[PDB]
Design a protein around this motif. Structure first.
Motif, PDB file in Angstrom:
ATOM      1  N   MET A 102      -9.695   2.386  -6.780  1.00  0.00           N
ATOM      2  CA  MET A 102     -10.220   1.043  -6.954  1.00  0.00           C
ATOM      3  C   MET A 102      -9.555  -0.150  -6.468  1.00  0.00           C
ATOM      4  O   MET A 102      -9.823  -1.200  -6.040  1.00  0.00           O
ATOM      5  CB  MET A 102     -10.658   0.738  -8.409  1.00  0.00           C
ATOM      6  CG  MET A 102     -11.734   1.690  -9.064  1.00  0.00           C
ATOM      7  SD  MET A 102     -13.224   1.845  -8.196  1.00  0.00           S
ATOM      8  CE  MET A 102     -13.241   3.487  -7.107  1.00  0.00           C
ATOM      9  N   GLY A 103      -8.146  -0.038  -6.730  1.00  0.00           N
ATOM     10  CA  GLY A 103      -7.215  -0.781  -6.085  1.00  0.00           C
ATOM     11  C   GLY A 103      -6.869  -0.493  -4.615  1.00  0.00           C
ATOM     12  O   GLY A 103      -6.572  -1.537  -3.859  1.00  0.00           O
ATOM     13  N   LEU A 104      -7.205   0.749  -4.105  1.00  0.00           N
ATOM     14  CA  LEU A 104      -7.001   0.740  -2.693  1.00  0.00           C
ATOM     15  C   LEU A 104      -8.418   0.014  -2.150  1.00  0.00           C
ATOM     16  O   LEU A 104      -8.280  -0.588  -1.060  1.00  0.00           O
ATOM     17  CB  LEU A 104      -7.275   2.356  -2.351  1.00  0.00           C
ATOM     18  CG  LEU A 104      -7.154   2.801  -0.900  1.00  0.00           C
ATOM     19  CD1 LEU A 104      -6.320   4.177  -1.038  1.00  0.00           C
ATOM     20  CD2 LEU A 104      -8.290   3.053  -0.312  1.00  0.00           C
ATOM     21  N   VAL A 105      -9.554   0.025  -2.640  1.00  0.00           N
ATOM     22  CA  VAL A 105     -10.725  -0.637  -2.280  1.00  0.00           C
ATOM     23  C   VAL A 105     -10.490  -2.300  -2.297  1.00  0.00           C
ATOM     24  O   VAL A 105     -10.576  -2.928  -1.443  1.00  0.00           O
ATOM     25  CB  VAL A 105     -11.993  -0.447  -2.848  1.00  0.00           C
ATOM     26  CG1 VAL A 105     -13.209  -1.312  -2.770  1.00  0.00           C
ATOM     27  CG2 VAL A 105     -12.203   1.126  -2.828  1.00  0.00           C
ATOM     28  N   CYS A 106      -9.804  -2.754  -3.519  1.00  0.00           N
ATOM     29  CA  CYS A 106      -9.205  -3.937  -3.658  1.00  0.00           C
ATOM     30  C   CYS A 106      -8.336  -4.284  -2.701  1.00  0.00           C
ATOM     31  O   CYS A 106      -8.363  -5.429  -1.967  1.00  0.00           O
ATOM     32  CB  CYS A 106      -8.689  -4.233  -5.116  1.00  0.00           C
ATOM     33  SG  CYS A 106      -8.287  -5.865  -5.520  1.00  0.00           S
ATOM     34  N   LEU A 107      -7.278  -3.661  -2.293  1.00  0.00           N
ATOM     35  CA  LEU A 107      -6.212  -3.992  -1.162  1.00  0.00           C
ATOM     36  C   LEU A 107      -7.072  -3.987   0.139  1.00  0.00           C
ATOM     37  O   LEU A 107      -6.800  -4.932   1.116  1.00  0.00           O
ATOM     38  CB  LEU A 107      -5.191  -2.958  -1.187  1.00  0.00           C
ATOM     39  CG  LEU A 107      -3.877  -3.348  -0.614  1.00  0.00           C
ATOM     40  CD1 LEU A 107      -2.814  -2.641  -1.393  1.00  0.00           C
ATOM     41  CD2 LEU A 107      -3.712  -3.333   0.674  1.00  0.00           C
ATOM     42  N   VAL A 108      -8.076  -3.136   0.567  1.00  0.00           N
ATOM     43  CA  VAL A 108      -8.570  -3.290   1.891  1.00  0.00           C
ATOM     44  C   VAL A 108      -9.349  -4.160   2.065  1.00  0.00           C
ATOM     45  O   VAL A 108      -9.884  -4.899   2.929  1.00  0.00           O
ATOM     46  CB  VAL A 108      -9.228  -1.783   2.361  1.00  0.00           C
ATOM     47  CG1 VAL A 108     -10.387  -1.382   1.503  1.00  0.00           C
ATOM     48  CG2 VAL A 108      -9.535  -1.821   3.612  1.00  0.00           C
ATOM     49  N   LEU A 113       0.812  -1.058   0.078  1.00  0.00           N
ATOM     50  CA  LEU A 113       0.016   0.048  -0.008  1.00  0.00           C
ATOM     51  C   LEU A 113       0.801   1.238  -0.004  1.00  0.00           C
ATOM     52  O   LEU A 113       0.337   2.153  -0.774  1.00  0.00           O
ATOM     53  CB  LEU A 113      -1.008  -0.103   1.192  1.00  0.00           C
ATOM     54  CG  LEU A 113      -2.046   1.080   1.526  1.00  0.00           C
ATOM     55  CD1 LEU A 113      -3.205   0.459   2.010  1.00  0.00           C
ATOM     56  CD2 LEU A 113      -1.737   2.058   2.425  1.00  0.00           C
ATOM     57  N   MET A 114       2.080   1.164   0.671  1.00  0.00           N
ATOM     58  CA  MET A 114       2.551   2.462   0.809  1.00  0.00           C
ATOM     59  C   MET A 114       3.630   2.746  -0.062  1.00  0.00           C
ATOM     60  O   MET A 114       3.674   3.794  -0.762  1.00  0.00           O
ATOM     61  CB  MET A 114       3.239   2.684   2.231  1.00  0.00           C
ATOM     62  CG  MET A 114       4.051   3.699   2.428  1.00  0.00           C
ATOM     63  SD  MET A 114       4.122   4.008   4.264  1.00  0.00           S
ATOM     64  CE  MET A 114       5.238   2.583   4.703  1.00  0.00           C
ATOM     65  N   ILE A 115       4.397   1.710  -0.963  1.00  0.00           N
ATOM     66  CA  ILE A 115       5.308   1.774  -1.992  1.00  0.00           C
ATOM     67  C   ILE A 115       4.601   2.410  -3.123  1.00  0.00           C
ATOM     68  O   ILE A 115       5.007   3.039  -3.810  1.00  0.00           O
ATOM     69  CB  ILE A 115       6.231   0.649  -2.250  1.00  0.00           C
ATOM     70  CG1 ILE A 115       7.592   0.872  -1.000  1.00  0.00           C
ATOM     71  CG2 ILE A 115       6.771   0.593  -3.445  1.00  0.00           C
ATOM     72  CD1 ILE A 115       7.300   0.422   0.228  1.00  0.00           C
ATOM     73  N   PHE A 116       3.416   1.333  -3.526  1.00  0.00           N
ATOM     74  CA  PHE A 116       2.552   1.590  -4.791  1.00  0.00           C
ATOM     75  C   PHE A 116       1.713   2.847  -4.493  1.00  0.00           C
ATOM     76  O   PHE A 116       1.513   3.292  -5.565  1.00  0.00           O
ATOM     77  CB  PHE A 116       2.106   0.347  -4.982  1.00  0.00           C
ATOM     78  CG  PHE A 116       2.896  -0.901  -5.446  1.00  0.00           C
ATOM     79  CD1 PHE A 116       3.441  -0.869  -6.969  1.00  0.00           C
ATOM     80  CD2 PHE A 116       3.723  -1.596  -4.520  1.00  0.00           C
ATOM     81  CE1 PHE A 116       4.371  -1.666  -7.225  1.00  0.00           C
ATOM     82  CE2 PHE A 116       4.487  -2.592  -5.165  1.00  0.00           C
ATOM     83  CZ  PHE A 116       5.113  -2.510  -6.313  1.00  0.00           C
ATOM     84  N   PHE A 117       1.169   2.984  -3.411  1.00  0.00           N
ATOM     85  CA  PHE A 117       0.376   4.114  -3.364  1.00  0.00           C
ATOM     86  C   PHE A 117       0.957   5.442  -2.952  1.00  0.00           C
ATOM     87  O   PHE A 117       0.089   6.622  -3.140  1.00  0.00           O
ATOM     88  CB  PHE A 117      -0.812   3.713  -2.348  1.00  0.00           C
ATOM     89  CG  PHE A 117      -1.872   2.672  -2.930  1.00  0.00           C
ATOM     90  CD1 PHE A 117      -2.060   2.494  -4.020  1.00  0.00           C
ATOM     91  CD2 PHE A 117      -2.783   1.916  -1.870  1.00  0.00           C
ATOM     92  CE1 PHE A 117      -2.605   1.504  -4.696  1.00  0.00           C
ATOM     93  CE2 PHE A 117      -3.961   0.983  -2.499  1.00  0.00           C
ATOM     94  CZ  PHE A 117      -3.517   0.788  -3.871  1.00  0.00           C
ATOM     95  N   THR A 127      -2.059  -1.099 -10.169  1.00  0.00           N
ATOM     96  CA  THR A 127      -0.989  -0.121 -10.039  1.00  0.00           C
ATOM     97  C   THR A 127       0.105  -0.176 -10.893  1.00  0.00           C
ATOM     98  O   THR A 127       0.483   0.703 -11.739  1.00  0.00           O
ATOM     99  CB  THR A 127      -0.815  -0.185  -8.496  1.00  0.00           C
ATOM    100  OG1 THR A 127      -1.790  -0.239  -7.610  1.00  0.00           O
ATOM    101  CG2 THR A 127       0.274   0.823  -7.981  1.00  0.00           C
ATOM    102  N   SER A 128       0.356  -1.545 -11.371  1.00  0.00           N
ATOM    103  CA  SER A 128       1.201  -2.005 -12.347  1.00  0.00           C
ATOM    104  C   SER A 128       0.945  -1.159 -13.691  1.00  0.00           C
ATOM    105  O   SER A 128       1.825  -0.320 -14.187  1.00  0.00           O
ATOM    106  CB  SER A 128       1.560  -3.442 -12.354  1.00  0.00           C
ATOM    107  OG  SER A 128       2.158  -3.900 -13.277  1.00  0.00           O
ATOM    108  N   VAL A 170      -8.229   4.361 -11.861  1.00  0.00           N
ATOM    109  CA  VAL A 170      -8.052   2.959 -11.764  1.00  0.00           C
ATOM    110  C   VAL A 170      -7.390   2.811 -10.136  1.00  0.00           C
ATOM    111  O   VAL A 170      -7.669   1.740  -9.428  1.00  0.00           O
ATOM    112  CB  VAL A 170      -7.202   2.588 -12.983  1.00  0.00           C
ATOM    113  CG1 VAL A 170      -6.503   1.323 -12.452  1.00  0.00           C
ATOM    114  CG2 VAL A 170      -8.243   2.295 -14.045  1.00  0.00           C
ATOM    115  N   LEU A 171      -6.705   3.792  -9.670  1.00  0.00           N
ATOM    116  CA  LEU A 171      -5.824   3.695  -8.403  1.00  0.00           C
ATOM    117  C   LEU A 171      -6.766   3.305  -7.229  1.00  0.00           C
ATOM    118  O   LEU A 171      -6.469   2.574  -6.431  1.00  0.00           O
ATOM    119  CB  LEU A 171      -4.916   4.731  -8.189  1.00  0.00           C
ATOM    120  CG  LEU A 171      -3.701   4.736  -9.346  1.00  0.00           C
ATOM    121  CD1 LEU A 171      -2.862   5.904  -8.914  1.00  0.00           C
ATOM    122  CD2 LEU A 171      -2.962   3.446  -9.009  1.00  0.00           C
TER     123      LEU A 171
END
Ligand code: HEA
Ligand code: HEA
Ligand SMILES: [Cu+2]
Lengths: 99, 29, 49, 49, 522, 31, 96
Positions: free
Chosen positions: E96-102, E53-57, E142-143, E93-94
């Motif tokens: 949505m990946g925060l929701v996907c990770l949580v 979460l922190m490196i990618f976000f 995120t990629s 897109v980002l």
């Protein structure tokens, strides 16, 4: 690049003063190089300060050389030659002025 | 035109409503 | 491909055969003084450029 | 040249010297402490079976 | 445009990541105190949520793309970024990946197995808590979003070059993030392929990184290395650009060695792909191969040294003005020299055999990546923020935030170079009894640093109230004091709104459509 | 809003962004 | 006539004047009959400390910076001490 071609080239660029910020900008950049300024350069500086109708820059050049003068001995030597130049100029030391 | 954009908006609306209905089954089994 | 909307392709072809370019591509360094007595000239279809 | 040339030469050369004396006393002190303690312990374990 | 929400999501996710820091270190204080789940149930889930979460976000979007989509077109002179449709795609897109990770954190058990999810039995045995598929999909989006922004930045600084800039005297941030996206192209889709390979293995049971069928995990180990080593070069090189600009404008606009600087950055961009190697030196490859690897990591250590000697020459002989971004740049430089020193330390052949998965490498990489990247992002925000946001940032509280960050992060990540050589294991939830010393002061420092983050939040709320007697002008006037302008142009652009003191001349805040007239260089 | 355009939405937004690891850890510790 | 009049002879005391521009228009050029208590004025007005050449940190502020750093560090260490110290290893004797 050397001492003398510097002195000649920027006195030639320096008698193109005609203005306040022009003479102050060329004083800034011709002062900020990697050599101490020649006494002929500062005599042309004081004469251009007389030309451009402004006194506090003629004070400012002296505290500028007070920083850059790199010792106290050359500072007293510049105080001597610039002292009788002040007698034919009329500009005070800051140390004589106490703002 | 938009006469096909309206039912596409509808099927997109259910396609982003119903996975949010899926996720309590995902957390609760 | 003529008589279409937005004739920006006109002056590419027009300026291609006559010289005057489309969207002021050209640079400037007129080797000047920068002095207020004779500053660099400013030409525009406006008062500010 | 002048004052900034004198200062870069004196500055970088004394930086060489200060880093050298800091790491040299560090390496001398701690590495010779290692040679004393470890070679004495190996001397005990080897010469005394 | 995209930049304001692009920064708001970064701050949201950053407070989430510092909360993960808080929880992890609060558990790591004393043996078995705060949490009963000392296992991959909830704790390795927490360290993967933390790390990925922190490196990618955080460092990835704000350092490449926020300053990218606000400050690459404004420094090169472009109107907007050249494909204005897919910045919008990638940034939406980002979260949505925060929701996907949580969601990967929330579900029943949690297959969180570190941020570098190694196959052999992270397989279907772990997919009763099937989280790690959601984690690899969040990493996959995120990629591709960073990929899309990379293409967009490349084409924007290729075709929308304003008629000022040729390719021989370019700005350092512009050429910096051009090298960054040109380096991101050559490493992203390899790991995208590895995501779809190992996702096919753990979903549709073909299992080629797993145990059965003679599947070999070392192919994935090469793959994620070959991605994650240029990934950390993406993490630092726009930081080098930002540090170049702040070191420029707070001391001395004549900086040392431009063409040398961009040659050194191209040298890093060349030599940084082909050493994926040291990260598992240890695994038992061939001796000539690993020796060649160790020899080439020394040559990737050269050009960064050339760059920091250049900025060492730059801050020398200039009128320093110790504002908060100049303090960030000088703390950057001091800590990053030591981190590259420990890089040379770890970079040797026969020392990773004593240093792998211990806290010595952990202190090293937190040292370079945290100090370098977060000090650069600090410098970027406290540097460009009154230009974009229009408000002055209450300099004294910025000073106390800098000092509090500096002492907090230093007292966190200096004891790890002691805890590591004694033989700590990495990602240990419950460490042995003889390691209780330095983790206590690491926990003290973590509370210090999260206090400083909350102080940053009070400063960010103080961005509302227009202080005039706090911070007005970087690079105070030399000898003039009656004339009034921005006092420096080492090339004579001065066209309409673009100059050599680049993009400080737009307005505060800049207009919704700037750049009507093309600028020109002298 | 009449009381919060952005006066509390910064504080509350960051309270949510700091508190979501707490509720994720809570529901994962409850299992 | 043609010289200034000690209207405000302590120019470094205030730039709280609304129209300083009238006092700047007031200035002249006979060169060294300038009445030195208002030859201070041209140097200060043209070269003083406001706006440009304003120091980054005011005299009062630097002590506030160090005080705030120490207060934040003390609040962090005190908060660490009053959050948790509970449930560790078995006993000191067991370590012995
Ligand atoms: C952005 C972050 C970043 C950066 C820039 C670097 C840069 C470097 N890293 Fe590091 N590193 C990481 C982040 C980073 N690393 C991470 C995240 C990991 C693994 C953790 C894992 O993923 O879990 C890692 C792992 C890692 C290992 C793996 C060992 C193990 O797993 O235990 C090694 C070993 O060689 C290494 C070395 C280096 C080197 C040589 C550099 C060099 O580029 C640095 C060179 C810089 C200089 C040398 C400084 C300037 C020069 C001087 C001050 C003057 C002259 C001196 C010399 C040139 C001798 N890194
Ligand atoms: C983005 C990089 C980054 C940053 C900044 C941090 C910061 C911190 N990290 Fe972490 N950490 C990693 C990346 C990072 N970490 C990685 C990759 C791992 C390895 C994971 C593993 O392998 O599983 C790791 C692992 C790791 C571990 C496990 C060690 C392991 O076994 O390897 C621990 C232990 O407690 C820890 C703690 C901390 C702490 C206390 C901080 C504190 O410094 C936090 C305080 C810092 C802040 C205050 C910064 C705030 C930033 C913002 C909100 C945005 C940026 C700037 C602003 C505009 C404010 N980290
Ligand atoms: Cu690496």
């Amino acid at each position: 690049e050397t001492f003398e071609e510097f002195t000649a080239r920027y006195e030639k660029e320096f008698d193109e003063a005609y203005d306040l910020f022009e003479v102050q900008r060329v004083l800034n950049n011709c002062f900020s190089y990697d050599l101490v300024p020649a006494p002929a350069v500062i005599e042309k500086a004081l004469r251009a300060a007389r030309r451009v109708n402004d006194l506090p820059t003629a004070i400012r050049v002296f505290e500028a050389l007070k920083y850059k003068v790199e010792n106290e001995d050359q500072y007293k030597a510049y105080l001597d030659e610039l002292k009788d130049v002040r007698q034919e100029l009329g500009v005070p030391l800051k140390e004589e002025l106490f703002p | 035109s938009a006469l096909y954009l309206y039912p596409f908006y509808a099927i997109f609306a259910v396609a982003v409503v119903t996975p949010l209905l899926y996720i309590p089954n995902a957390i609760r089994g | 491909d003529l008589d279409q909307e937005t004739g920006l392709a006109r002056l590419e072809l027009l300026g291609k055969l006559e010289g005057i370019d489309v969207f002021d591509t050209k640079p400037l360094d007129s080797s000047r003084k920068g002095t207020m007595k004779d500053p660099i000239i400013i030409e525009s279809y406006d008062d500010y450029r | 040249t002048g004052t900034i040339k004198r200062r870069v030469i004196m500055d970088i050369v004394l930086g060489f010297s200060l880093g050298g004396v800091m790491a040299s006393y560090w390496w001398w002190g701690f590495h010779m402490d290692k040679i004393n303690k470890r070679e004495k312990f190996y001397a005990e374990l080897a010469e005394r079976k | 445009d995209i930049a304001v929400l692009y920064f708001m999501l970064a701050i949201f996710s950053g407070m989430a990541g510092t909360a993960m820091s808080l929880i992890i270190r609060l558990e790591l204080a004393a043996p078995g105190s705060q949490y009963l789940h000392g296992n991959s149930q909830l704790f390795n889930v927490l360290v993967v949520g933390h790390a990925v979460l922190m490196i990618f976000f955080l460092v990835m979007p704000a350092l490449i793309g926020g300053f990218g989509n606000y400050l690459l077109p404004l420094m090169i002179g472009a109107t907007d970024t050249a494909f204005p449709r897919i910045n919008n795609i990638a940034f939406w897109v980002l979260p949505m990946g925060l929701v996907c990770l949580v969601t990967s954190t929330l579900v029943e058990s949690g297959a969180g197995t570190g941020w570098t999810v190694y196959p052999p039995l992270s397989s279907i045995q772990a997919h009763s808590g099937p989280s790690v598929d959601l984690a690899i999909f969040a990493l996959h989006l995120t990629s591709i979003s960073s990929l899309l922004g990379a293409i967009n930045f490349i084409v924007t600084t290729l075709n929308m070059r304003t008629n000022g800039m040729t390719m021989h005297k370019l700005p350092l941030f512009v050429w910096s993030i051009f090298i960054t996206a040109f380096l991101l192209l050559l490493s992203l889709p390899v790991l995208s392929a590895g995501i779809t390979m190992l996702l096919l293995d753990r979903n549709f049971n073909t299992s080629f990184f797993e145990v059965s069928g003679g599947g070999d995990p070392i192919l994935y180990e090469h793959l994620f290395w070959f991605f994650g080593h240029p990934e950390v070069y993406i993490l630092i090189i726009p930081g080098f650009g930002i540090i170049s600009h702040v070191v420029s404008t707070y001391s001395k606009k004549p900086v040392f060695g431009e063409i040398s600087m961009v040659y050194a950055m191209a040298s890093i961009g060349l030599l940084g792909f082909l050493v994926w190697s040291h990260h598992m030196y240890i695994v038992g490859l061939d001796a000539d191969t690993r020796a060649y690897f160790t020899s080439a990591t020394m040559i990737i250590a050269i050009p960064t040294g050339i760059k920091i000697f250049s900025w060492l020459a730059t801050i020398h002989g200039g009128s320093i003005r110790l504002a908060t971004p100049m303090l960030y740049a000088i703390a950057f430089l001091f800590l990053f020299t030591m981190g590259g020193l420990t890089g040379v330390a770890l970079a040797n052949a026969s020392l990773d055999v004593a240093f792998h998965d211990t806290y010595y490498v952990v202190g090293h990489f937190h040292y370079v990546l945290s100090m370098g990247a977060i000090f650069s992002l600090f410098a970027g925000y406290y540097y460009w923020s009154p230009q974009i946001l229009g408000l002055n940032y209450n300099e004294k509280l910025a000073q106390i935030q800098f000092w509090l960050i500096f002492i907090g992060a230093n007292v966190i990540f200096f004891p790890m170079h002691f805890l590591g050589i004694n033989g700590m294991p990495r990602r240990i939830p419950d460490y042995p009894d003889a390691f209780a010393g330095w983790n206590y002061v690491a926990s003290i420092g973590s509370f210090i640093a999260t206090l400083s983050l909350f102080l940053f939040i009070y400063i960010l709320y103080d961005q509302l109230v227009n202080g005039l007697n706090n911070k007005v002008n970087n690079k105070s006037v030399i000898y003039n004091k009656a004339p009034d302008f921005v006092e420096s142009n080492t090339i004579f652009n001065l066209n309409t709104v673009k100059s050599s003191s680049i993009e400080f001349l737009l307005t505060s805040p800049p207009a919704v459509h700037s750049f009507n007239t093309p600028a020109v260089q002298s | 809003g009449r009381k919060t355009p952005y006066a509390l939405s910064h504080f509350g937004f960051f309270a949510i962004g700091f508190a979501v690891p707490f509720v994720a850890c809570y529901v994962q510790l409850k299992k | 006539v043609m010289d200034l009049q000690s209207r405000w002879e302590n120019m470094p005391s205030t730039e709280q004047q609304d129209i300083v521009s009238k006092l700047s228009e007031r200035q002249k050029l006979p060169w060294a009959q300038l009445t030195e208590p208002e030859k201070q004025a041209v140097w200060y007005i043209s070269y003083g400390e406001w706006g440009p050449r304003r120091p980054v940190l005011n005299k009062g502020d630097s002590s506030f910076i160090a005080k705030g750093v120490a207060a934040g560090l003390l609040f962090s260490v005190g908060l660490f001490a009053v959050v948790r110290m509970a449930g560790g290893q078995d006993a000191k004797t067991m370590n012995k």
